[PDB]
Amino acid sequence: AFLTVERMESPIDSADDLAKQTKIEYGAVEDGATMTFFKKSKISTYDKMWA
Amino acid sequence: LNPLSPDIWMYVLLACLGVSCVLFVIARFSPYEWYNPHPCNPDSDVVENNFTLLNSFWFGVGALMQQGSELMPKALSTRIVGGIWWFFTLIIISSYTANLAAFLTVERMESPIDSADDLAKQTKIEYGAVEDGATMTFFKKSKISTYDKMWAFMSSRRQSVLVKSNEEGIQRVLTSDYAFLMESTTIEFVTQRNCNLTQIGGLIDSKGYGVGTPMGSPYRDKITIAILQLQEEGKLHMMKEKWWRGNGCPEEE
Amino acid sequence: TLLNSFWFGVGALMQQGSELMPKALSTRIVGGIWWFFTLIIISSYTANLA
Amino acid sequence: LIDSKGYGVGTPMGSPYRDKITIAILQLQEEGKLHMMKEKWWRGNGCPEEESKEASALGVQNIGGIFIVLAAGLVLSVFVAVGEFLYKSKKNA
Amino acid sequence: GNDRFEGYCIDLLRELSTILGFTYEIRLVEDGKYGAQDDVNGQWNGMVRELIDHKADLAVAPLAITYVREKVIDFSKPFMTLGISILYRKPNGTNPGVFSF
Ligand SMILES: CCCCCCCC/C=C/CCCCCCCC(=O)O[C@@H](COC(=O)CCCCCCCCCCCCCCC)COP(=O)([O-])OCC[N+](C)(C)C
Ligand SMILES: CCCCCCCC/C=C\CCCCCCCC(=O)O[C@@H](COC(=O)CCCCCCCCCCCCCCC)COP(=O)([O-])OCC[N+](C)(C)C
Ligand SMILES: CCCCCCCC/C=C\CCCCCCCC(=O)O[C@@H](COC(=O)CCCCCCCCCCCCCCC)COP(=O)([O-])OCC[N+](C)(C)C
Ligand SMILES: *[C@@H]1O[C@H](CO)[C@@H](O[C@@H]2O[C@H](CO)[C@@H](O[C@@H]3O[C@H](CO)[C@@H](O)[C@H](O[C@@H]4O[C@H](CO)[C@@H](O)[C@H](O)[C@@H]4O)[C@@H]3O)[C@H](O)[C@H]2NC(C)=O)[C@H](O)[C@H]1NC(C)=O
Ligand SMILES: *[C@@H]1O[C@H](CO)[C@@H](O)[C@H](O)[C@H]1NC(C)=O
């Protein structure tokens, strides 16, 4: 039972899988080039990351 | 053979030959491992020991396979060896049954290769290229250690793995174990329209498409300003998701 | 005997053993590979049923 | 990748030597000068990713304590093997 | 003197000094800033200000080709294409120790 609950577990793979789980915290450089991108984006995934 | 790593399968067999020899040395050098064959005449000079070199090897294999044997060591100097080898052979087998009951309930389908480096070695899986296109031109002029060895196959296997078109190249993957090399954008179009294909590996080269202008044109600069405007407001990524997608794929098990 | 040799095959397959215990190296290899055979059958029967 | 931008050799506004560097960079990309430099600076230490890669088989990192308690049993038995041989020779006296 | 510096951009410029004829005069920017349009005056600060005022001549640096920098200075072709990616810890194992059985 140990060796099958460790095997079944899979981590995140993309921003789409990380757009949902608000447990794992997001992050950015304060007002750099990365924070500027999510503030102006209109894509459904990347606007929720700015929320 | 999978649920235990190949490092362990050597370390068990080395311990199987190891503990068998140590039990042979102790039992011959112990004073309380000495019997008599037939005790009708209880005298000396018939006193012998049962632990031979073949029998000590047989106790190691016979206890490892949960079947036991008939030696049954007598003194405390040998029962500690027979006591710790029996605890050793449970934890091996009850971790072999437990790990094999983890494979058969959760199946992670791995890929044989993940990069061109893993595919530079195995010449069983065949390479491939467009005949004298932009991909075949790259491997012919490259000097990198991985990518020159990939050209050593295709130079020796011309008209065998060198297809002349993309439509016959995707079909050749669809028939045999073919590992066709081509541009990354078309792979992102084929994989989204075919759920029996994938893009393994990252990028090999790094080039780019471009809006062509005549030599020394003034409207080269205005398109240069225009393209960078549409990349920041995300016009191109809404178009790249519009054409290269179009069918959300599956696969479930 | 012929009945005892059949009894060593069934008796080792069922993890209960028997009382023959072969002596020479010509027969302990047969008794050594059949014991490794009867683990991989049973530990794949328990694993697949789990 | 989320976005797709690029670094660039900056020139003043309307410079003639923008075009010569434009020809120069594309020459070094085809003969692989930049990829030999990108592997020179961003690498420099081959990591351990091939040592585990989730290790989907039990190894010494997962089961190897059973070999230590196996070796501890054999060392204890030899110390009994010396100690029990001396107990018999004392009885002979 | 002009030998303080070493890295990727130094190795790029030496090959640019080889096939294209010059002798480089590496000189650090006073601000220590890439470049951005300051809102209250419109005055650029960093490397992009020296490229407009012709105090410097080249800007071999991590200078991202973007829209607002294109209308004031002019870039070459991208010698390195990048993007935004997620930095994250590797999955922590299970920490079995050695007596995990
Ligand atoms: C007499 C003969 C002795 C020979 C010994 C010479 C060696 C030959 C052995 C031979 C053993 C049989 C073959 C197995 C070898 C396989 C390789 C292997 O297992 O390496 C393993 C070592 O584990 C060992 O095998 C060495 C352990 C030595 C302990 C010696 C007894 C002292 C205990 C005191 C008794 C006190 C008594 C008080 C209580 C009563 C590697 O494991 P690791 O790297 O060390 O673990 C780190 C975990 N990590 C990797 C995740 C970080
Ligand atoms: C329940 C389990 C624990 C308990 C049992 C422990 C048993 C012993 C412990 C370890 C031995 C088992 C592994 C061998 C060493 C590793 C070599 C290897 O990797 O496989 C090799 C195969 O060759 C073999 O596997 C043949 C050996 C099988 C055991 C034979 C009985 C020996 C027991 C004593 C009897 C002697 C009688 C003496 C009479 C006095 C390599 O080939 P391959 O890799 O398979 O190729 C396929 C590639 N693939 C796998 C990637 C697809
Ligand atoms: C008739 C009988 C009546 C009495 C019964 C009770 C008698 C009890 C007598 C002795 C039992 C031991 C108790 C002492 C306390 C242990 C602490 C210690 O120092 O061990 C050390 C070594 O030991 C090991 O290697 C780990 C296993 C613990 C020892 C128990 C083995 C059982 C063998 C059964 C044998 C049968 C006993 C036969 C007795 C003749 C600590 O190990 P370590 O250094 O931390 O490991 C390093 C790992 N590393 C390199 C990865 C870091
Ligand atoms: C799971 O993955 C498998 C990967 O191999 C996949 O592919 C099939 O594999 C078998 C053998 O490995 C192929 O069988 C023969 O392969 C030879 C190549 O030497 C082919 O010439 C031939 O395929 C035929 O090709 C014809 C075109 O000339 C075509 O019209 C025929 O219909 C036929 O496909 C042999 O059949 C086999 O081709 C591979 N492909 C397919 C589609 O079966 C498995 O299919 C895949 N299984 C599942 C369930 O997903
Ligand atoms: C993939 O290939 C299999 C044959 O191997 C075929 O049955 C199936 O229809 C194909 N397509 C998908 C989407 O699975």
PDB file of N, CA and C in Angstrom, chain B residues 101-144:
ATOM      1  N   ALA B 101       2.895  -5.802  -6.770  1.00  0.00           N
ATOM      2  CA  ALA B 101       1.495  -5.429  -6.591  1.00  0.00           C
ATOM      3  C   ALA B 101       1.317  -3.919  -6.658  1.00  0.00           C
ATOM      4  N   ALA B 102       2.385  -3.192  -6.984  1.00  0.00           N
ATOM      5  CA  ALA B 102       2.263  -1.762  -7.236  1.00  0.00           C
ATOM      6  C   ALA B 102       2.403  -1.465  -8.723  1.00  0.00           C
ATOM      7  N   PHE B 103       3.119  -2.325  -9.451  1.00  0.00           N
ATOM      8  CA  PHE B 103       3.176  -2.205 -10.904  1.00  0.00           C
ATOM      9  C   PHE B 103       1.833  -2.541 -11.526  1.00  0.00           C
ATOM     10  N   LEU B 104       1.225  -3.637 -11.077  1.00  0.00           N
ATOM     11  CA  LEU B 104       0.073  -4.182 -11.781  1.00  0.00           C
ATOM     12  C   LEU B 104      -1.212  -3.441 -11.440  1.00  0.00           C
ATOM     13  N   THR B 105      -1.155  -2.484 -10.513  1.00  0.00           N
ATOM     14  CA  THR B 105      -2.352  -1.717 -10.185  1.00  0.00           C
ATOM     15  C   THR B 105      -2.273  -0.281 -10.682  1.00  0.00           C
ATOM     16  N   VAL B 106      -1.068   0.202 -10.978  1.00  0.00           N
ATOM     17  CA  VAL B 106      -0.836   1.570 -11.445  1.00  0.00           C
ATOM     18  C   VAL B 106       0.197   1.439 -12.557  1.00  0.00           C
ATOM     19  N   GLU B 107      -0.232   1.676 -13.792  1.00  0.00           N
ATOM     20  CA  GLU B 107       0.641   1.506 -14.951  1.00  0.00           C
ATOM     21  C   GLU B 107       0.997   2.875 -15.514  1.00  0.00           C
ATOM     22  N   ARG B 108       2.264   3.258 -15.371  1.00  0.00           N
ATOM     23  CA  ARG B 108       2.797   4.467 -15.997  1.00  0.00           C
ATOM     24  C   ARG B 108       3.538   4.041 -17.257  1.00  0.00           C
ATOM     25  N   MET B 109       2.926   4.299 -18.408  1.00  0.00           N
ATOM     26  CA  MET B 109       3.513   3.939 -19.697  1.00  0.00           C
ATOM     27  C   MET B 109       4.666   4.884 -19.999  1.00  0.00           C
ATOM     28  N   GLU B 110       5.891   4.380 -19.888  1.00  0.00           N
ATOM     29  CA  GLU B 110       7.065   5.183 -20.181  1.00  0.00           C
ATOM     30  C   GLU B 110       7.368   5.156 -21.677  1.00  0.00           C
ATOM     31  N   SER B 111       8.194   6.102 -22.113  1.00  0.00           N
ATOM     32  CA  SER B 111       8.741   6.122 -23.454  1.00  0.00           C
ATOM     33  C   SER B 111      10.165   5.577 -23.429  1.00  0.00           C
ATOM     34  N   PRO B 112      10.616   4.917 -24.508  1.00  0.00           N
ATOM     35  CA  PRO B 112      11.991   4.399 -24.533  1.00  0.00           C
ATOM     36  C   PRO B 112      13.036   5.502 -24.566  1.00  0.00           C
ATOM     37  N   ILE B 113      12.726   6.586 -25.268  1.00  0.00           N
ATOM     38  CA  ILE B 113      13.657   7.695 -25.440  1.00  0.00           C
ATOM     39  C   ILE B 113      13.010   8.994 -24.983  1.00  0.00           C
ATOM     40  N   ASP B 114      13.834   9.970 -24.607  1.00  0.00           N
ATOM     41  CA  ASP B 114      13.327  11.247 -24.128  1.00  0.00           C
ATOM     42  C   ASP B 114      14.038  12.375 -24.863  1.00  0.00           C
ATOM     43  N   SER B 115      15.135  12.054 -25.544  1.00  0.00           N
ATOM     44  CA  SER B 115      15.937  13.088 -26.182  1.00  0.00           C
ATOM     45  C   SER B 115      16.664  12.489 -27.375  1.00  0.00           C
ATOM     46  N   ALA B 116      17.365  13.351 -28.111  1.00  0.00           N
ATOM     47  CA  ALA B 116      18.229  12.871 -29.180  1.00  0.00           C
ATOM     48  C   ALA B 116      19.464  12.171 -28.634  1.00  0.00           C
ATOM     49  N   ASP B 117      19.869  12.490 -27.399  1.00  0.00           N
ATOM     50  CA  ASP B 117      21.014  11.828 -26.779  1.00  0.00           C
ATOM     51  C   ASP B 117      20.723  10.363 -26.486  1.00  0.00           C
ATOM     52  N   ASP B 118      19.506  10.060 -26.032  1.00  0.00           N
ATOM     53  CA  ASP B 118      19.124   8.671 -25.806  1.00  0.00           C
ATOM     54  C   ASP B 118      18.871   7.955 -27.124  1.00  0.00           C
ATOM     55  N   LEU B 119      18.609   8.716 -28.187  1.00  0.00           N
ATOM     56  CA  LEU B 119      18.337   8.122 -29.487  1.00  0.00           C
ATOM     57  C   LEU B 119      19.576   8.158 -30.375  1.00  0.00           C
ATOM     58  N   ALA B 120      20.658   8.783 -29.895  1.00  0.00           N
ATOM     59  CA  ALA B 120      21.923   8.755 -30.623  1.00  0.00           C
ATOM     60  C   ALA B 120      22.608   7.400 -30.505  1.00  0.00           C
ATOM     61  N   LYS B 121      22.261   6.622 -29.480  1.00  0.00           N
ATOM     62  CA  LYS B 121      22.949   5.363 -29.209  1.00  0.00           C
ATOM     63  C   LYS B 121      22.248   4.185 -29.878  1.00  0.00           C
ATOM     64  N   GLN B 122      20.944   4.048 -29.648  1.00  0.00           N
ATOM     65  CA  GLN B 122      20.178   2.912 -30.150  1.00  0.00           C
ATOM     66  C   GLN B 122      19.973   3.030 -31.653  1.00  0.00           C
ATOM     67  N   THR B 123      20.730   2.247 -32.421  1.00  0.00           N
ATOM     68  CA  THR B 123      20.567   2.207 -33.869  1.00  0.00           C
ATOM     69  C   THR B 123      19.483   1.228 -34.306  1.00  0.00           C
ATOM     70  N   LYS B 124      18.835   0.556 -33.354  1.00  0.00           N
ATOM     71  CA  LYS B 124      17.665  -0.263 -33.637  1.00  0.00           C
ATOM     72  C   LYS B 124      16.490   0.579 -34.115  1.00  0.00           C
ATOM     73  N   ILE B 125      16.133   1.616 -33.360  1.00  0.00           N
ATOM     74  CA  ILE B 125      15.129   2.580 -33.793  1.00  0.00           C
ATOM     75  C   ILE B 125      15.774   3.459 -34.854  1.00  0.00           C
ATOM     76  N   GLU B 126      15.180   3.501 -36.041  1.00  0.00           N
ATOM     77  CA  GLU B 126      15.800   4.148 -37.189  1.00  0.00           C
ATOM     78  C   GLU B 126      15.616   5.659 -37.135  1.00  0.00           C
ATOM     79  N   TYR B 127      16.614   6.385 -37.641  1.00  0.00           N
ATOM     80  CA  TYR B 127      16.579   7.839 -37.758  1.00  0.00           C
ATOM     81  C   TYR B 127      15.780   8.219 -38.997  1.00  0.00           C
ATOM     82  N   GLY B 128      15.734   9.499 -39.339  1.00  0.00           N
ATOM     83  CA  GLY B 128      15.047   9.908 -40.547  1.00  0.00           C
ATOM     84  C   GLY B 128      15.149  11.402 -40.768  1.00  0.00           C
ATOM     85  N   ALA B 129      14.923  11.798 -42.023  1.00  0.00           N
ATOM     86  CA  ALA B 129      14.971  13.200 -42.425  1.00  0.00           C
ATOM     87  C   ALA B 129      14.265  13.426 -43.757  1.00  0.00           C
ATOM     88  N   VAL B 130      13.909  14.675 -44.045  1.00  0.00           N
ATOM     89  CA  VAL B 130      13.456  15.080 -45.372  1.00  0.00           C
ATOM     90  C   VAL B 130      14.684  15.021 -46.270  1.00  0.00           C
ATOM     91  N   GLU B 131      14.531  14.452 -47.465  1.00  0.00           N
ATOM     92  CA  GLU B 131      15.648  14.330 -48.392  1.00  0.00           C
ATOM     93  C   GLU B 131      16.087  15.694 -48.913  1.00  0.00           C
ATOM     94  N   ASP B 132      17.268  16.128 -48.453  1.00  0.00           N
ATOM     95  CA  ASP B 132      17.922  17.387 -48.817  1.00  0.00           C
ATOM     96  C   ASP B 132      17.050  18.604 -48.527  1.00  0.00           C
ATOM     97  N   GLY B 133      16.364  18.590 -47.390  1.00  0.00           N
ATOM     98  CA  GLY B 133      15.590  19.738 -46.962  1.00  0.00           C
ATOM     99  C   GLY B 133      16.417  20.643 -46.075  1.00  0.00           C
ATOM    100  N   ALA B 134      15.763  21.219 -45.067  1.00  0.00           N
ATOM    101  CA  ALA B 134      16.478  22.045 -44.102  1.00  0.00           C
ATOM    102  C   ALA B 134      16.964  21.224 -42.919  1.00  0.00           C
ATOM    103  N   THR B 135      16.326  20.082 -42.661  1.00  0.00           N
ATOM    104  CA  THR B 135      16.738  19.235 -41.549  1.00  0.00           C
ATOM    105  C   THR B 135      17.974  18.422 -41.914  1.00  0.00           C
ATOM    106  N   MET B 136      17.999  17.873 -43.132  1.00  0.00           N
ATOM    107  CA  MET B 136      19.141  17.086 -43.589  1.00  0.00           C
ATOM    108  C   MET B 136      20.369  17.965 -43.794  1.00  0.00           C
ATOM    109  N   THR B 137      20.153  19.239 -44.125  1.00  0.00           N
ATOM    110  CA  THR B 137      21.257  20.174 -44.304  1.00  0.00           C
ATOM    111  C   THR B 137      21.925  20.493 -42.967  1.00  0.00           C
ATOM    112  N   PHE B 138      21.151  20.461 -41.879  1.00  0.00           N
ATOM    113  CA  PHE B 138      21.682  20.812 -40.565  1.00  0.00           C
ATOM    114  C   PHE B 138      22.632  19.744 -40.036  1.00  0.00           C
ATOM    115  N   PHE B 139      22.252  18.471 -40.155  1.00  0.00           N
ATOM    116  CA  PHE B 139      23.091  17.398 -39.630  1.00  0.00           C
ATOM    117  C   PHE B 139      24.331  17.163 -40.480  1.00  0.00           C
ATOM    118  N   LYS B 140      24.320  17.609 -41.735  1.00  0.00           N
ATOM    119  CA  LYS B 140      25.474  17.428 -42.611  1.00  0.00           C
ATOM    120  C   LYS B 140      26.581  18.421 -42.265  1.00  0.00           C
ATOM    121  N   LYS B 141      26.207  19.588 -41.736  1.00  0.00           N
ATOM    122  CA  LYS B 141      27.192  20.634 -41.486  1.00  0.00           C
ATOM    123  C   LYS B 141      27.528  20.765 -40.006  1.00  0.00           C
ATOM    124  N   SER B 142      26.826  20.035 -39.145  1.00  0.00           N
ATOM    125  CA  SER B 142      27.023  20.168 -37.708  1.00  0.00           C
ATOM    126  C   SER B 142      28.312  19.485 -37.266  1.00  0.00           C
ATOM    127  N   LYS B 143      28.868  19.969 -36.153  1.00  0.00           N
ATOM    128  CA  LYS B 143      30.096  19.413 -35.600  1.00  0.00           C
ATOM    129  C   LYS B 143      29.925  18.929 -34.166  1.00  0.00           C
ATOM    130  N   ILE B 144      28.700  18.934 -33.642  1.00  0.00           N
ATOM    131  CA  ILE B 144      28.423  18.486 -32.283  1.00  0.00           C
ATOM    132  C   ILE B 144      28.534  16.965 -32.252  1.00  0.00           C
TER     133      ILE B 144
END
